[PDB]
Structure 1
């Protein structure tokens, strides 16, 4: 009855390898973000969305208010000690930004303010704190702050003796910096003005003119991220260079002012490695001998001299490690589960952190001091709010330090299961799902199936407070651990990228069918959601199996895949050839075209869908979802509502917009709940 916006068709042929695709909405891309007909189409869609969802206004308010009422307005972080000081992060009621405090470790009573984001944000349009570190002598505070919302960070220095600031600002930094052990020399990373990619390391003397800063290193290859790190030993500052596949590390003697970069292992395509330095040894996590990584000890760089501490295993992905006085602690994945293992440096005694929950995540938390037997580690499950634990590595005594406070919540009201689905090619795909016990009746409950399935990112099963808004309205919430994700290790990822990317979409469909078939949800009330690379997932799945889902939410979806990946002028295209392929190669053009959602939209019936995007961001370019919705409006045969919501907030809007984050969830959940009623 309401006539949706109709974008002007401006046929734009794109020909590659003699293959012509006519893109009618190519013109919705405006890099300068000024063209008034481009804005007219986005505003028109926004008004259509506002008018279509007007009836859900009350439900949105109910969702918003009940989601905010679950969390406390306070939040004090768990205090940690580093270099003889205790540090706590403080969120006060009605405060937008964190306050950072500290006190001498032997002090109980008084806390000093390091920085109050609220006072730094005063008379500013935007404030992000991107970086915070005290010097080793505890006298100076290096802060990385963004006042412009360009994710370009300025570094300044505060003298903690009197709360006076130094005169200089380091501008256009990544926010990545390290103190030398003199508490006078700082290393920082400069980003390119145009491309915005970190490419330069400078040395700066605090209290001096940034013009005096020496260029320490320049990365010649812009697929390589430049990060700074500092070893557990404090002996080295690390220049960490890495593409998506390949690493290189240079050492800087943190004990001098005049150090030059010392090569560790020169880059070799598909060799990923990270290092730390402790107890006069290098520790290396490396995939040199297996995809699932190993851990090595060395006295020098020379790869040939690396002693195997932990050999790569096909069944166990080595994720990360921490170094303590008496113990190595590793984070691993096995059988679709995260785990922690400790190994005594002397005895070689192995202990495993035991976990009795089918759908949980565990990780190394922040452990800034190695001279301890106390390990801080995180835990979360689909039924158990996020917990910080402290484990005595020797006695095995485990104490809880903090729990995520969740109001109007009792954990016994909910059940979770790990399900395995045999995919169409016989591969076993894990699923994590959670629901309210008292409203569950097989074959009756609506289903919300969430996936990502790219970059080897895992959708690890953890607690969501916002999720309870679906769970307390009868929803079964499902994480589908599809290939392209990392849940079953490096091979799980590789079996859902490049010439295997289609397994990601097939796994999502196979998991959804099996869940309905086994009675976990109502076949006529199946919903799905995914964002960015997970929006690519939503886009392909509704092209390939439109009848499976009642309703979809596609957030900032990557849908114009072939056209975007043919254009290096688009931010990220050059860094994403190792994910999707380079369609300038006919083999990748053919394979990608087959799933590229924008290219595969046909005259068929589609689910109800809400599509989100953002005008003044950069994650997926705003024009992809806008072109996608225009082509869906042109071609789809059904009468169901298709909506595009474009976030207009011109710089960002993000002046601590967790208000906004909850508002977006309210809008998307109300859209889905209205469809499930």
Structure 2
């Protein structure tokens, strides 16, 4: 079958006297209306449909077995907050969650707080982006998106009679806090054009939003504006943060006329976050070390901050929770997540021990500090996600919930942590899982998954959908490459800006070691990654095409120089601290060397499926479309190259989780057919 051939319209882009001619610059159409652009995306979708037509039966088998291992009756673990018990309920044949509550001393009767199915009646789209009852338990504030544009309407329900007030706060981030009067709420307004959060307003419930007062306006575009409330309830925080740099303003939660009080003025490369409890500020801050410390203060002044935990090169400090008698910290060390608890009085330290080679642990939702019971999450490549509750004093651990997986026997699978010595001598961790009875050294197809940007960690956890590959002989690998966070801030920093190439080198060095050690069949190595992990997919296949049989590149960031030169593209002005600004000759040069679109060569490429989405305003559909067009023009092999563009507008990843399972089934069928 003859693949679609995009029209070439040579478009020169000249930077620092370097001219790049982009034949497909025209595929970018911000209005997503141009019929010629739509024609190319439709033709590629038709080609993908026709190429993958024989995989239909396998797609059905995969889809049905993925849905079959999940319950359709889900009920959350109930939690208590301000004398009420809260539960979320999904029943089969309901797109949306029902949220219920009852008085804490009640068992029998539950009251509906909000039914998403009911709220979605006569609407094209529904996302709940926020839910919070007032301190006096009388009012519900909800942040809802009916239009799919990530702009939230805040509305108010009287819980006494289930009546709604008739005002709406429009174009909000969904971030809002009640003042302690259960009458005033603070909310974040998004910029009209950029949709970036930039204003804090104050609303009296029951009044017209025209009466609302502007409390704070952020001048720096790169600074996210979010609202928080301290554990003590004494302060509403205006949390301002770039990727590198923080600033917190305090709002007295106990007055109706409060103005923002500076905590510590922003200083480039000083990231901090605060809470308030027991008459102290608690600060997680990188002021003295990239791996962060914890500080106590009676006042804002940075020089008064007292050190509770000093930053350590070996231990990244990720977060903390405050309880009556205990401090609990989330840390990473030697490539594992950990929890430690420290007694406020005795200074007694306990670590929460797990022996699984490939697990992750985290602080879960603990809305009440007056307790000895900690809720924390656990998952491994062999153990479905678990909520535990720990008695911090007695060390008694109970299981509150497990992820229910049907047709699944945990003993059928093995997992391992492998360390690979990268080409520059740096040790890269790897987490891998496979079915015991079908494993034979050098025989198995290998799926290598990476991300490797922003300090995001691909922490090893359980996947139900992954069983569809493991039960078909695949060794599934997480490559914990530089640019991720698995070994702390230095791990991230050694895979961004002028070290970004280490991300792609680590992925190739990991893949080569695994093949050398017989984890996979050299001829049946597959890889997948999405977004900045699609950047990884693009760079790896330019640099080392021969390693991989097949590739899935989801919504890939591939036109890196051109996108990062254009502040009109959503996200660009917030990403200079990740890739660099190619307006500077040093960054242009460094970035162009890996920018996958720019490094497409007349060479043999793996089989590849590239995905994207038309109407998702923060998915830049043109980048993978241009990339596929250029690959079609230059590649020397006869292997399959497909572009699938989601033409939808709605549902996304939840409720249309069936859409999510459909995409997984398509992608896994594509790979399984190549590995057969």
User: One fold, TM greater than 0.5?
Assistant: yes
The equivalent residue for 1:274 is 273
Instruction: Please state how far the C-alpha of 1:192 moved relative to its aligned partner.
Output: 1.0
Take 1:610 and 1:160, find their aligned partners in 2: how far apart are those partners? 50
Instruction: Please state how far the C-alpha of 1:655 moved relative to its aligned partner.
Output: 7.9
Instruction: Please state how far the C-alpha of 1:188 moved relative to its aligned partner.
Output: 0.3
Take 1:319 and 1:236, find their aligned partners in 2: how far apart are those partners? 23
User: For residues 153-210 of structure 1, what are the alpha-carbon distances to aligned partners after superposition, in whole Å with 9 as ceiling and x for unaligned?
Assistant: 0000000001010111000000000000000000000001211000000000001111
User: For residues 199-227 of structure 1, what are the alpha-carbon distances to aligned partners after superposition, in whole Å with 9 as ceiling and x for unaligned?
Assistant: 00000000111100000000000100000
Take 2:276 and 2:305, find their aligned partners in 1: how far apart are those partners? 13
User: For residues 538-572 of structure 1, what are the alpha-carbon distances to aligned partners after superposition, in whole Å with 9 as ceiling and x for unaligned?
Assistant: 00000000000000000000000000000000001
Take 1:195 and 1:591, find their aligned partners in 2: how far apart are those partners? 28
Of 158-167 and 613-622, more deviation after overlay is shown by: 613-622
Take 1:308 and 1:175, find their aligned partners in 2: how far apart are those partners? 34
* Residue pair 1:556, 1:619 contacting (<8 A) in 2 also: no
The equivalent residue for 2:152 is 153
Instruction: Please state how far the C-alpha of 1:602 moved relative to its aligned partner.
Output: 0.5
User: For residues 492-550 of structure 1, what are the alpha-carbon distances to aligned partners after superposition, in whole Å with 9 as ceiling and x for unaligned?
Assistant: 00000000000000000000000000000000000000000000000000000000000
Instruction: Please state how far the C-alpha of 1:662 moved relative to its aligned partner.
Output: 0.3
Structure 1 segments (4+ residues) deviating >6 Å: 652-655
User: For residues 377-434 of structure 1, what are the alpha-carbon distances to aligned partners after superposition, in whole Å with 9 as ceiling and x for unaligned?
Assistant: 0000000000000000000000000000000001000000000000000000000000
* Residue pair 1:558, 1:620 contacting (<8 A) in 2 also: no
* Residue pair 1:617, 1:652 contacting (<8 A) in 2 also: no
* Stretches of structure 1 lacking an aligned partner (at least 5 in a row): 71-75
Instruction: Please state how far the C-alpha of 1:447 moved relative to its aligned partner.
Output: 0.2
* Residue pair 1:459, 1:479 contacting (<8 A) in 2 also: yes
User: For residues 252-274 of structure 1, what are the alpha-carbon distances to aligned partners after superposition, in whole Å with 9 as ceiling and x for unaligned?
Assistant: 00000000000000000000000
User: For residues 206-253 of structure 1, what are the alpha-carbon distances to aligned partners after superposition, in whole Å with 9 as ceiling and x for unaligned?
Assistant: 011110000000000010000000000000000000000000000000
* Residue pair 1:125, 1:655 contacting (<8 A) in 2 also: no
Instruction: Please state how far the C-alpha of 1:619 moved relative to its aligned partner.
Output: 3.7
Take 1:665 and 1:16, find their aligned partners in 2: how far apart are those partners? 40
Take 2:652 and 2:287, find their aligned partners in 1: how far apart are those partners? 45
| DSSP 3-state at the match of 1:629 | helix
Instruction: Please state how far the C-alpha of 1:57 moved relative to its aligned partner.
Output: 0.3
| DSSP 3-state at the match of 1:245 | coil
| DSSP 3-state at the match of 1:342 | strand
1:164 aligns with 2:163: yes
| DSSP 3-state at the match of 1:402 | strand
| DSSP 3-state at the match of 1:42 | helix
| DSSP 3-state at the match of 2:5 | coil
Of 437-446 and 615-624, more deviation after overlay is shown by: 615-624
Instruction: Please state how far the C-alpha of 1:651 moved relative to its aligned partner.
Output: 5.5
Take 2:170 and 2:619, find their aligned partners in 1: how far apart are those partners? 26
Take 1:107 and 1:32, find their aligned partners in 2: how far apart are those partners? 53
Take 1:24 and 1:126, find their aligned partners in 2: how far apart are those partners? 37
* Residue pair 2:184, 2:205 contacting (<8 A) in 1 also: yes
* Residue pair 1:559, 1:624 contacting (<8 A) in 2 also: yes
* Residue pair 1:178, 1:187 contacting (<8 A) in 2 also: yes
| DSSP 3-state at the match of 1:448 | strand
User: For residues 88-108 of structure 1, what are the alpha-carbon distances to aligned partners after superposition, in whole Å with 9 as ceiling and x for unaligned?
Assistant: 000011111000000000000
1:535 aligns with 2:534: yes
| DSSP 3-state at the match of 2:563 | helix
Take 2:650 and 2:365, find their aligned partners in 1: how far apart are those partners? 33
Instruction: Please state how far the C-alpha of 1:652 moved relative to its aligned partner.
Output: 6.2
The equivalent residue for 1:460 is 459
* Residue pair 2:318, 2:330 contacting (<8 A) in 1 also: yes
* Residue pair 2:149, 2:617 contacting (<8 A) in 1 also: no
Instruction: Please state how far the C-alpha of 1:656 moved relative to its aligned partner.
Output: 2.4
Alignment map for 1:71-86 (pairs within 5 Å): 76-86=75-85
* Residue pair 2:326, 2:342 contacting (<8 A) in 1 also: yes
| DSSP 3-state at the match of 1:358 | coil
User: For residues 62-86 of structure 1, what are the alpha-carbon distances to aligned partners after superposition, in whole Å with 9 as ceiling and x for unaligned?
Assistant: 000000000xxxxx00000000000
Q: TM-score scaled to structure 1, two decimals?
A: 0.99
Instruction: Please state how far the C-alpha of 1:32 moved relative to its aligned partner.
Output: 1.0
User: For residues 585-630 of structure 1, what are the alpha-carbon distances to aligned partners after superposition, in whole Å with 9 as ceiling and x for unaligned?
Assistant: 0000000000000000010000000000000113440000000000
Distance 1:359 1:540, change over 3 A: same
Instruction: Please state how far the C-alpha of 1:356 moved relative to its aligned partner.
Output: 1.1
* Stretches of structure 2 lacking an aligned partner (at least 5 in a row): 70-74
Take 2:91 and 2:484, find their aligned partners in 1: how far apart are those partners? 37
Take 1:9 and 1:314, find their aligned partners in 2: how far apart are those partners? 52
Instruction: Please state how far the C-alpha of 1:653 moved relative to its aligned partner.
Output: 6.5
Take 1:552 and 1:8, find their aligned partners in 2: how far apart are those partners? 26
Take 1:256 and 1:429, find their aligned partners in 2: how far apart are those partners? 52
The equivalent residue for 2:94 is 95
| DSSP 3-state at the match of 1:503 | helix
Distance 1:126 1:269, change over 3 A: same
The equivalent residue for 1:447 is 446
Take 2:320 and 2:653, find their aligned partners in 1: how far apart are those partners? 34
Q: CA RMSD in A?
A: 0.7
Take 1:143 and 1:651, find their aligned partners in 2: how far apart are those partners? 20
* Residue pair 1:168, 1:208 contacting (<8 A) in 2 also: yes
Take 2:43 and 2:651, find their aligned partners in 1: how far apart are those partners? 20
| DSSP 3-state at the match of 1:58 | helix
Q: TM-score scaled to structure 2, two decimals?
A: 0.99
* Residue pair 1:332, 1:338 contacting (<8 A) in 2 also: yes
User: For residues 347-371 of structure 1, what are the alpha-carbon distances to aligned partners after superposition, in whole Å with 9 as ceiling and x for unaligned?
Assistant: 0000000001000000000000000
